[PDB]
Amino acid sequence: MMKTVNELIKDINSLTSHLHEKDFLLTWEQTPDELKQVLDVAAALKALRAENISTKVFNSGLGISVFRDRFSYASALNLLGLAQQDLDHGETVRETANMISFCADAIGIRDDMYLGAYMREVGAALDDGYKQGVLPQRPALVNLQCDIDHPTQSMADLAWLREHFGSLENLKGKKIAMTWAYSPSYGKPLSVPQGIIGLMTRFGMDVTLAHPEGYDLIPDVVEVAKNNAKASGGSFRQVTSMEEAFKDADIVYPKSWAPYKVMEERTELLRANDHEGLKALEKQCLAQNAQHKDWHCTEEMMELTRDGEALYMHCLPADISGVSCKEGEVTEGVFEKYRIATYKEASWKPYIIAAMILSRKYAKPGALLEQLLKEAQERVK
Amino acid sequence: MMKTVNELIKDINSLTSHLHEKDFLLTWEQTPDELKQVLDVAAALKALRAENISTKVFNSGLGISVFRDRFSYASALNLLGLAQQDLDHGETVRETANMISFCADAIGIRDDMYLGAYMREVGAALDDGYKQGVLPQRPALVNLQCDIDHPTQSMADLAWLREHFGSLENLKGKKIAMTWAYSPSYGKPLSVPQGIIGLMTRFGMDVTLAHPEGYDLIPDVVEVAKNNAKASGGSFRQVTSMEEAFKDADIVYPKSWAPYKVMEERTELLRANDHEGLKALEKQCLAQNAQHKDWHCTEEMMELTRDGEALYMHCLPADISGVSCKEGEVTEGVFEKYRIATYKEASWKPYIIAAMILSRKYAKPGALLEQLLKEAQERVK
Amino acid sequence: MMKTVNELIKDINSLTSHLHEKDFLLTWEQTPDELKQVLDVAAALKALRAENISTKVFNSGLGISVFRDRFSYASALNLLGLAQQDLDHGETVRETANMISFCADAIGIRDDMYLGAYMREVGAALDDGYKQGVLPQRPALVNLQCDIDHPTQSMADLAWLREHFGSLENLKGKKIAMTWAYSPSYGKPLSVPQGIIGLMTRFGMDVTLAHPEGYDLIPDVVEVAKNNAKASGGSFRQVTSMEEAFKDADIVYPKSWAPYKVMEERTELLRANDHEGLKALEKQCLAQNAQHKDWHCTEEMMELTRDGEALYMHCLPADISGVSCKEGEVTEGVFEKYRIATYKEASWKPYIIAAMILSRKYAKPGALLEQLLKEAQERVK
């Protein structure tokens, strides 16, 4: 609706934001108004797109993809009119940042390395190239996933929660279980669960985190979650069993990850081409994980949630038992029931990424949307 | 010409089609009007493009490429204004279809697997995502090649025949020899010859299929060909020698393929990572094929065709003896003579693919072309 | 400025050029007016882009990348509105050229092979396809690097020299040292130093070439350099030491390359899949190069140049000692000092490549720029 978008624009224009002066790396480094800006902008873009109104903001320009280690970033670039180009390294990051940015209005970085920086160096390098007149524009920087957070996934998940439940206010008092789940694939990043507990705790939700012993998340993020919950009127709890977390839950998000000590050692020999050390590491982790195969989102597990009908969430693809693999994170039956939910959840990501790009490029994204809405250029003829 | 295109549009508007409600997987599942629609739309797009008129229909949107196993699909997407994105699996096809389609207006699938489905599951999954409101558009589905048919190649070949010979009516009574030819490369799909005999038999042509013993096409397609010929006033004949087929031919199409029993076993160990079984299979096939090296389109062979001047057809690239390889499907001399013909033949493919996309998206593609023609936006400034 | 661009257009319109009738393969096959056209067009595009004016000339169309063996070509295509598509062979070049060009307005070729042709065959094949009506447009051909020249790099380097020093006239009498420098990576092409001495000698500069014994450039290019210098009032000198070349230099360009006899043998076994011969060749070259590790652009070396403040040039990436590698072409400290210079130098490449494409497509690129300037369509909304 023109009405829906007009209301979104009034909401956006009323917000105080400085996203135009910084990079959206971690959700917990953004204020509540800034988070709300990205969500509302994403909502306006999705609604415009739904009614065949073009949201093309760039007539030319590149969005670069940099991978330190699938469709959302490319979709977001294309939505705004940018063309994607992939990059086919920590020590040289600064020179590479400038080299790829002459005609780039966005750079998206997916980073798998755990060592206890990279994207902050990229941002400082972009600032330098722009301030010294090397770059005609300062590219927007998109965190497509780092060792600490996965803001693009977490924000899209929150945008979906807000659609599903009707508002952000309606999320207060809702119980969400962020749990581990078994995967045949070792070495999944801790970015997602950290991103979830880091963000959800800011909206007064009752967040329960559950995982087997040894799979602890980074201590600094746990402490952010606890402090977020205090200030937003929510709660944060850590438990040792999946059932514990699932009981009376409104929302379950059962997804595998590797211990961060594993990711560290994987990273070290990944850097050293130690292929044999790898297969040795992989072989062990697969054995550590196999004793927790019972962390499996089954019909029996869902029965314990509120009304036995919690909203099931997971980022796509999921490891579906008997489909994708022999034993995975969720059964065929539970996935079939919630398939449309998980699709709608994923559908928000391109809009969230596009909103992040716009929020860096325009101090007042609400002005830009009103312009797009008034021109009402068709997307398809 | 504006006149040429105006006549094409009147032709298109007079046709009865339901391509907007189904996927163009097999040419023989389409009616004669529906085939004619794709051909006429492709012709209008080619003519518009030739006189520097933009045929951009999308201001943003993705076309996804999915490969189960080169330039035409990307060219077609770009012609209409879509950006190509490739996918870098049968069991998970449904979830993948939705995951890649949020911002896609087209999906192109090239499928090499022989097992006796995939694209029909994709289509049903797209229908589901659209009907449940996951996908804001139902993407057009393009068969870039399957185990059964290669409609994109066969239709472009027919569009060329129609240009070369002047009309579809002029194709009645023309003899076309679809023959095997020797290739150093084992494991070429049976899609092309099946596609050719499945389509050409619908236009009253005299279709002769020839191949060594053991290289039989799928029985179901042979029967479609025979039944097509009956109803269109054409003929279909199977012969055991290349000369037999070439004699008095108006058109020759001499191209290698592997027996379907070979493709089956290749597929099985391809799925099982049996690299050793592969090199063993390859080694044998190369020996089976080498006894038919004589299936070679030479100057001597062309002399037997009508006037010794049949139109030579082949999809690009061809295995050219002494150029691409030691011994192949056609000699350097015959290819040099027909090179421009084979280039023009290939030039139709992007237009055919684009016409298929448009034919799914618009019930009346003739309306859309008239709009494009009236706006007459330049392609190049 | 509108004024700056208006003056550039008057400059361009006053030039005599036939670049619209040939391919820009080697800078020394172009006249001085033709070189100046590319430079001035590149300058106009850069200035337009800087003030948010769209230089989109194509509403659809492909630019193909062909690699015989990173961001500039894609950036240039996108600047003009073309979409990049990569090609994933000498004997079949002619057929491939047509096959990829139906919807291409540009083809970019990077060629690493040394054997004593390829791009000239591509150009003749494009001419044929266009003249016989196969191709609706004759694609522009861009040399992204060959065994002989790297015009795209050399022209961007000259465009930067002209910006840095203020004019082409201001380059007369300037001393530029094109020297070898040590790299841990064997097998760098001789294209760059040949391109530099082949071009710079045409503007009355005092060009000094320096390298260890055995690293001689192709004799034919050396002779072009010597003859260029004579006719432009410059000089060309060959020396045996880096210090010799660096002394009193205004500009230093210290970059590694392999002897051309090495590149020949690398090419031969590259064609023959001789992996073992390769590692054997690599192992030897690394030992030949290691005795010249002293060819290192250090702070001490820079002190010998004019005022100890020569402009340092290098194409990106550089091998930076202690950063990219243990020992390389330039120290961390010298690179930090000149980093912005090398970035600005690289920033010209997309504009140079785009100017080459425009210079082939329009006999009078000045007309096209005036049109772009008058429309003043925004790049970003």
Cβ neighbours of residue A306 under 8 Å, at least 6 residues apart?
Answer: A175, A248, A249, A250
Same-domain pairing of A374 and A344:
no
Tell me chain C's radius of gyration from C-alpha atoms: 21
Contact C379 A59 (CB under 8 A): yes
Q: Is the peptide bond before C317 cis (omega within 30 degrees of 0)?
A: yes
- Residue whose C-alpha is closest to residue C111's, from C85, C74, C79, C142: C142
Asked if residue A148 and residue A11 are part of one domain, the reply reads: yes
**N-terminal to C-terminal alpha carbon distance within chain B:** 19
Task: At A31, list the tokens.
Answer: 């204020």
What element of type H or E holds C247? none
Return the SS3 of C63: strand
Whichever domain contains A116, its CATH number is: 3.40.50.1370
In this complex, do B103 and A350 lie within 8 Å of one another by their Cβ atoms?
A: yes
Please answer whether residues A84 and A73 qualify as being in contact, where contact means their C-beta atoms are separated by less than 8 angstroms. Answer: yes
Report how far residue B92's alpha carbon sits from residue B88's, in angstroms, rounded to the nearest whole number.
Answer: 14
Share in percent of chain C as helix, strand, coil (round to 5): 50, 15, 35
A37 and A18 belong to one structural domain: yes
Q: Look up residue C52 and give its two tokens.
A: 């948010």
**Whole-number CA gyration radius for chain B:** 21
- A110 DSSP β-pair partners: A67, A145
Q: Do C346 and A102 touch (CB under 8 A)?
A: yes
Classify residue C220 by burial, with Cβ atoms within 10 Å: 0-12, 13-18, 19+: exposed
Q: How far apart are the C-alpha atoms of C145 and C137, rounded to whole Å? A: 24
Going by C-alpha positions, the residue among A315, A289, A294, A126 that lies closest to residue A214 is: A289
Q: Which residues pair with A66 in a beta bridge?
A: A109
With contact defined as beta carbons under 8 Å apart, do C252 and C312 qualify?
yes
Residues in A closer than 8 angstroms to C320, CB to CB, are: 92
Which amino acid would we find at residue B319?
A: D
Q: Within this chain, do residues C275 and C376 fall inside the same structural domain, yes or no?
A: no
Q: Are C224 and C347 in contact (CB under 8 A)?
A: no
CA–CA distances in Å: residue B309 to residues B158, B300, B306, C26, C309: 19, 11, 6, 43, 73
Is the peptide bond preceding residue A317 cis, with omega within 30 degrees of 0? Answer: yes
* Long-range contacts (CB closer than 8 Å, 24 or more residues apart) made by C45-50: C45/C79, C45/C351, C45/C354, C45/C355, C45/C358, C45/C369, C46/C347, C46/C348, C46/C351, C47/C1, C47/C4, C47/C5, C47/C8, C48/C5, C48/C369, C48/C372, C48/C373, C49/A136, C49/C79, C49/C351, C49/C379, C50/A136
How far, in Å, CA of C245 to CA of C299, rounded? 15
Return the HEC string of chain A: CHHHHHHHHHHHHCCCCCHHHCCCCCHHHCCHHHHHHHHHHHHHHHHHHHCCECCCCECCCEEEEEEECCCHHHHHHHHHCCEEEECCCCCCHHHHHHHCCCCEEEEEEEECCCCCCHHHHHHHHHHHHHHCCCCCCCCEEEEEECCCCCHHHHHHHHHHHHHHHCCCHHHCCCEEEEECCCCCCCCCCCHHHHHHHHHHHHHCCEEEEECCCCCCCCHHHHHHHHHHHHHHCCEEEEECCHHHHHCCCCEEEECCCCCHHHHHHHHHHHHCCCHHHHHHHHHHHHHHHHCCCCCCECHHHHHCCHHHCCEECCCCCCCEECCCECCCCEEHHHHHHHHHHHHHHHHCHHHHHHHHHHHHHCCCHHHHHHHHHHHCCECEC
Dmax (CA) of chain C:
61
Given CB atoms, is A347 within the 8 Å cutoff of chain B? yes
Of the candidates B17, B47, B48, B43, which has an alpha carbon nearest to the alpha carbon of residue B32?
Answer: B17
C103 touches chain B (CB under 8 A): yes
Structure tokens, C15: 């030039």
| Cα–Cα dist B145/B106, whole Å | 15
Query: Do B280 and B378 reside in the same domain of the chain?
Result: no
Resolution of the structure, angstroms: 2.0
DSSP code, position C273 = T
* φ, ψ for residue C44, nearest 5 deg: -65, -45
Chain B, 28 to 57: residues with Cβ < 8 Å from chain C are 49-50, 54-56
- CA-nearest of A231, A236, A232, A230 to A217 is A236
- Candidates C98, C192, C183, C100; CA nearest to C154 is C192
Contacts of B among chains (3+ CB pairs under 8 A): A, C
- Closest by CA position to C224, among listed C148, C327, C280: C148
Residues in chain C: 381
End-to-end alpha carbon distance in chain C: 19
d(CA A215, CA C26): 60
Cα(A52)–Cα(A96) distance, rounded to whole angstroms? 38
- Are C239 and C245 a contacting pair, CB within 8 Å? yes
What does the buried/exposed string (b/e) look like for A37-61 if buried means 16 or more CB atoms within 10 Å of the residue's CB? bbbbbbbbbbbbbeeebbbbbbbbb
Tell me, yes or no, whether A341 and A369 share the same domain: no
Residue C5 phi, psi (nearest 5):
-70, -40
Query: How far, in Å, CA of C263 to CA of C268, rounded?
Result: 9
Instruction: Give chain A's length.
Output: 381
Q: What is the 3-state secondary structure (H, E, C) of C176-218?
A: EEEECCCCCCCCCCCHHHHHHHHHHHHHCCEEEEECCCCCCCC
Same-domain check for residues B320 and B361 = no
Whether residues C180 and C260 share a domain: the answer is yes
Residues C193 and C310 in one domain: yes
Q: Is B378 on the interface with C (CB under 8 A)?
A: yes
Cβ separation of A85 and C81 shorter than 8 Å? no
Same domain, A145 and A89: yes
Question: Rounded to a whole number, what is the distance in angstroms from the first to the last CA of chain A?
Answer: 19
Neighbouring C-beta atoms of residue C241, cutoff 10 Å: 14
Among the partner-chain residues C59, C95, C96, the one whose CB lies closest to the CB of B377 is: C59
Q: Name the residue in chain B with its Cα closest to that of A318.
A: B95
Cβ atoms of B193 and B257 closer than 8 Å: yes
- How far apart are the C-alpha atoms of C379 and C381, rounded to whole Å? 7
Q: Hey, CA dihedral for A340, A343, A348, A351, is it positive or negative?
A: negative
Q: Which residue has the tokens 């009707």?
A: A166
Q: What kind of experiment solved this structure?
A: X-ray
**A323, two tokens:** 């489909």
Q: A79 contacts in B (CB within 8 Å)?
A: 60, 103
**Of A165, A159, A197, A205, which Cα lies nearest the Cα of A178?**
A197
Measured CA angle at A151 (ends A350, A137), to 5 deg: 70
What is the number of domains present in chain C?
Answer: 2
Using CB atoms and an 8 Å cut-off, which of residues 114-153 of chain B contact chain A? 129, 132-137
Please tell me whether residues A132 and A166 are part of one structural domain: no
Q: Is B213 on the interface with C (CB under 8 A)?
A: no
Provide the shortest C-alpha distance from residue C28 to chain A (in Å).
Answer: 28
- In chain B, count H helices and then E strands: 15, 11
Set of chain A residues whose Cβ sits within 8 Å of the Cβ of B57: 380-381
Of C57, C92, C135, the CB nearest to B380: C57
Instruction: Quote the domain boundaries for residue A86.
Output: 3-152+349-381
**The dihedral formed by the CA atoms of C125, C131, C136 and C141, expressed in degrees to the nearest 10:** 40
Cβ–Cβ contacts within 10 Å for residue C309, how many? 11
Cβ(A251)–Cβ(A175) below 8 Å: yes
Specify the 3-state DSSP secondary structure of B174.
Answer: coil
**How far apart are alpha carbons A217 and A258 in whole angstroms?**
9
| Helix locations, chain B, DSSP H | 2-13, 32-50, 72-80, 93-99, 118-131, 151-165, 191-200, 219-232, 242-246, 260-271, 275-290, 299-303, 332-347, 349-361, 365-375
**Cross-chain Cβ contact B102/A71 below 8 Å:** yes
Which token pair is A161? 């929660």
What are the beta bridge partners of residue B237? B208
Amino acid symbol at B342: T
Contacts of residue C114, Cβ cutoff 8 Å, sequence gap at least 6: C147, C189, C260, C263, C264, C266, C267
The answer to whether A95 contacts C316, with C-beta atoms less than 8 Å apart, is: yes
Between CA A122 and CA A97 the distance in angstroms is: 6
Q: After which residues is chain B broken (C to N over 2.5 A)?
A: 69, 88, 116
B34 φ, ψ (degrees, to nearest 5): -70, -40
Pairing of strands B175-179, B251-254: parallel
Q: Is B156 exposed, middle or buried (0-12, 13-18, 19+ CB in 10 A)?
A: buried
Per DSSP, B216 falls in state P
- Cβ–Cβ contacts within 10 Å for residue C316, how many? 16
What's the rounded Cα separation, in Å, for the pair A178 and A198? 11
Same domain, A336 and A370: no
C72 within 8 A of C353, measured Cβ to Cβ: yes
Bridge partners of residue C85, in order along the sequence? C64
The tokens of C284 are what?
Answer: 């030897």
Q: What angle do CA A114, A63, A34 make, to 5 degrees?
A: 70
